[PDB]
Structure 1
Amino acid sequence: IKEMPQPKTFGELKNLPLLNTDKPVQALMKIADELGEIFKFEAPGRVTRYLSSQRLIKEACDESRFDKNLSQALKFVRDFAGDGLFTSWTHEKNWKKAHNILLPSFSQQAMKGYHAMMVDIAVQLVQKWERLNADEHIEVPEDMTRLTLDTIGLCGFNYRFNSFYRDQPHPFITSMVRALDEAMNKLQRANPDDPAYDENKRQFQEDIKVMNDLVDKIIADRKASGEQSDDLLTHMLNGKDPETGEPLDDENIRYQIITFLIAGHETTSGLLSFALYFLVKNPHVLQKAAEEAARVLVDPVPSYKQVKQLKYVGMVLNEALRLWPTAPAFSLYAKEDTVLGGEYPLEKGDELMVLIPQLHRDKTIWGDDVEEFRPERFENPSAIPQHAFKPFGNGQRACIGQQFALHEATLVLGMMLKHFDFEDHTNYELDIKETLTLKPEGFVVKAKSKKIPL
């Protein structure tokens, strides 16, 4: 039995002021580098333990011992994402019900059906970059967010956000981004009930009402039209849970749609941005990925089967998820008293935080070249120890969107590498902005067309 370390305290506020920063995940990463594989973190009325080693995380990923917990971030997101899949407890009736209904909508098979819609948006991104003048550059996370938001709108509910037609966001997205900003900002507040936060609280309540009103109208409009478009909203209106025999109610469908819009906006766009960042910093890797793109994508429009053959591009995306898992943490609670790694006794209900970027830097797993970008690490999943690589979370509470995200990211990165050469014209210095998720901020490149027709 070992006594785990704890970072510096601030009297009655304990560790809470360590989160008073615009980059709290990167701050926690630095604490993990100093303190090691486990540390205690305390706030008024809160204790958790930050895990960084595959040795301890492999135990945390035992579903017989640990279930998904809502971190404070997810509790604050629940104020608008409700009992949607991402912000529900495993024991809430709507979790397993929505999980059973939606799993077929998110399978590798279902991706054949979403592929044409994904290609519609990917082609819009390629045509935008083709049409840039020689003196112009690309705002990478901006354009990746335009793509991923538009893809989930079209596959979610046959709705065009038309992000490539715009500078200014859709009213739903103004409210969604501001609600995510209030949720993630409220985490750090030493004195949340201070009157200085009354405008923040008023504006939050207004943003929740906006998201609810606009999504409720999308659902109402679809039931009214009777249209049977092959999208998630149709699957949720028609689907029955095989267990209960019940469909989702309109309020839960709204929470699922809000949840999918958060994911499309925040996560896949981060992955594509980090992937292109690592490729321009690693020209030998960029060349090898570009060679695969050219050899496989032999038609003007990629097919589903061709995306499945971009294996090296898939490895590039996994190695980007290794160094910068854009959804960087998940939380677990002990189902019963249990001992972690033979050294740390936990009681029933005790909380754990998995710090995914630190897990992914465990040198006992990846070796001394752990900071290097090497997609070849992923050639043989059987050579990777259990629970070493967790960018989609764990077990039954893992990302339902994983096949969707990787299909879209593989398609688009393959088209980008086929159609353009890239230049890191500014020698960009990685600056990671934290919203719900991690993204390169200010990452810009130049793209020179290979002049290959669509």
Structure 2
Amino acid sequence: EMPQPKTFGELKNLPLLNTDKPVQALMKIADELGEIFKFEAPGRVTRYLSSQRLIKEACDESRFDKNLSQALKFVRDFAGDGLFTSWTHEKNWKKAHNILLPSFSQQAMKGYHAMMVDIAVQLVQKWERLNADEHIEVPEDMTRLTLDTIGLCGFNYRFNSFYRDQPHPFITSMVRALDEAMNKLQRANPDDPAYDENKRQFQEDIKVMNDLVDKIIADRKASGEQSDDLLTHMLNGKDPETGEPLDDENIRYQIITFLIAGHETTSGLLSFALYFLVKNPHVLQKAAEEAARVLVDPVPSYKQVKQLKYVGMVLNEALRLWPTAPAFSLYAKEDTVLGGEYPLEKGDELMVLIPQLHRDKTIWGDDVEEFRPERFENPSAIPQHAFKPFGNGQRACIGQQFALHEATLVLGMMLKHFDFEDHTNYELDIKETLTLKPEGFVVKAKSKKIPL
């Protein structure tokens, strides 16, 4: 007798996801029904998990492996067998995993630091150059930053997002590709002639992304020039197990994948972090005091970024409340029983609803809606599988250290260089595009007039 939300005859629970904010809907359902609920659609079923008690079993890699949700299957049409949209048992997953992990270590970030600073300084300069009555469109500027950072650090390519209003022909295609994949989740009969125009458009965007990226691949191969970026590492890199390199088609899929995941997740993080800071002035002040104490040079060093302890706590608390990639899907590797109560058969699916996990009162206390970075004073105190904004196990975010170093550097610089004003008393409105962002979030930034 597993709880299940309201049904719509033969459509079962499907129309519940016919909303612009499905994750927030699922969270509300979770509040009503508790740690587990069944979700059915025609010809399919999953179970949404919200408690640490159940999710710690789900995160047992001997019992469950990553499933490609429906959203991911559609993303796969353009991200292919890149790391994010591949099955664990695909040869290209384990090859790419083995090859790329070294280039994504905490220690590899030393090599990317200079290129991260390049983009971060562009952001700071932009804000320094605004006139008095002007304001900042936060998610928009964080996206310019994060896209450009992954473009530069990973492929030595400048999207030059701070020189534009109209973003790159690649990104528009990529955004529109992501849009189309999102929509198909609420679409009876995909072969309907009504959607011929949508299929047409989907195809055009893939060609944009594939042509640009392949071209860069080939230019670099011909060139033979040595950067230390992700692309170089991939061109020369051999998988220790097979002894094979990634082929050029897979390298493309990896590039598209890095560009997608998670420029948008990382910009979300920065946007939510600044949101929580301006809504919690004592926390902002503590974070600003750290930045001023630590960032003593015009150019932040790698070591200095590692010393921004409180800024790191701020980012983790923002990830707790609004994890920007808010769910991931699993399947049972064999018949097993979840929580001593719910029998599952091989192949049965789960969804881990991360925002709800992160609101588990048995783990976090009663005050789960409050923004308190101090929860992360000692991150080791957090029980296993209680905090999972970067997913689980061998299928966890390969970009976690990149994202966190980038976000810490930038937020550090922001807090060093400006005072912030929530001049509209912004009301949180979370836009969902698979990922989460605070739509319409704006601030004013008054320079502290500290030279770069």
Task: Tell me which interval the TM-score lies in, with the shorter structure as reference length.
Answer: over 0.9
Residue from 407, 411, 414 that aligns with 1:413: 411
Q: Note the C-alpha offset of 1:194.
A: 2.4
Which 5+ residue runs of structure 1 have no aligned equivalent? none
* Residue in 2 that maps onto 1:446: 444
Q: Note the C-alpha offset of 1:381.
A: 2.5
Native 8 Å contact 1:151 1:264 kept in 2: no
Q: Note the C-alpha offset of 1:205.
A: 1.1
Of 10-19 and 192-201, deviating more is 192-201
Q: Note the C-alpha offset of 1:185.
A: 1.1
Partner SS, residue 329 of structure 2: strand
Report the Cα distance in structure 1 between the residues aligned to 2:172 and 2:180, rounded to whole angstroms.
12
Residue from 174, 177, 182 that aligns with 2:172: 174
Report the Cα distance in structure 2 between the residues aligned to 1:386 and 1:155, rounded to whole angstroms.
32
Residue from 368, 372, 378 that aligns with 1:380: 378
String of CA shifts for 1:176-203, please: whole Å, max 9, x gaps. 0000000111112133332221111110
* Residue in 1 that maps onto 2:242: 244
Q: Percent identity?
A: 100
Aligned counterparts, 1:271-282, within 5 A: 271-282=269-280
String of CA shifts for 1:360-397, please: whole Å, max 9, x gaps. 01111111110000000011233212111000000000
String of CA shifts for 1:271-321, please: whole Å, max 9, x gaps. 000000000000000000000000000000000000000000000000000
String of CA shifts for 1:117-168, please: whole Å, max 9, x gaps. 0000000000000000001000000000000000000011100000000000
Q: Note the C-alpha offset of 1:356.
A: 0.3
Report the Cα distance in structure 2 between the residues aligned to 1:444 and 1:196, rounded to whole angstroms.
38
Native 8 Å contact 1:52 1:359 kept in 2: yes
Partner SS, residue 107 of structure 2: helix
Query: Could you state the TM-score of these two structures normalised by the residue count of structure 2?
Result: 0.99
String of CA shifts for 1:94-130, please: whole Å, max 9, x gaps. 0010000000110011100000000000000000000
Report the Cα distance in structure 1 between the residues aligned to 2:323 and 2:376, rounded to whole angstroms.
15
Partner SS, residue 434 of structure 1: strand
String of CA shifts for 1:19-55, please: whole Å, max 9, x gaps. 1111111111111111111011111111000000001
Of 77-86 and 14-23, deviating more is 14-23
Q: Note the C-alpha offset of 1:426.
A: 0.3
Q: Note the C-alpha offset of 1:204.
A: 0.4
2:206 is the alignment partner of 1:208: yes
Which 5+ residue runs of structure 2 have no aligned equivalent? none
Of 107-116 and 382-391, deviating more is 382-391
Partner SS, residue 336 of structure 1: coil
Native 8 Å contact 1:17 1:190 kept in 2: no
Report the Cα distance in structure 2 between the residues aligned to 1:265 and 1:385, rounded to whole angstroms.
28
Of 11-20 and 371-380, deviating more is 11-20
Report the Cα distance in structure 2 between the residues aligned to 1:170 and 1:114, rounded to whole angstroms.
23
String of CA shifts for 1:47-106, please: whole Å, max 9, x gaps. 000000001001101101000000001100000000000000000000010000000110
Report the Cα distance in structure 1 between the residues aligned to 2:118 and 2:307, rounded to whole angstroms.
20
Native 8 Å contact 1:356 1:391 kept in 2: yes
Q: Note the C-alpha offset of 1:266.
A: 1.1
* Residue in 2 that maps onto 1:347: 345
Native 8 Å contact 1:100 1:242 kept in 2: yes
How many residues end up aligned between the 2 structures?
452
Residue from 351, 364, 367 that aligns with 2:365: 367
Report the Cα distance in structure 2 between the residues aligned to 1:283 and 1:357, rounded to whole angstroms.
24
Partner SS, residue 447 of structure 1: strand
Query: Could you state the TM-score of these two structures normalised by the residue count of structure 1?
Result: 0.99
Partner SS, residue 141 of structure 1: helix
Native 8 Å contact 1:84 1:252 kept in 2: yes
Native 8 Å contact 1:266 1:436 kept in 2: no
Native 8 Å contact 1:329 1:356 kept in 2: yes
CA RMSD after TM alignment: 0.7
String of CA shifts for 1:233-269, please: whole Å, max 9, x gaps. 1000000001011000000000000000002431100
Report the Cα distance in structure 2 between the residues aligned to 1:442 and 1:6, rounded to whole angstroms.
34
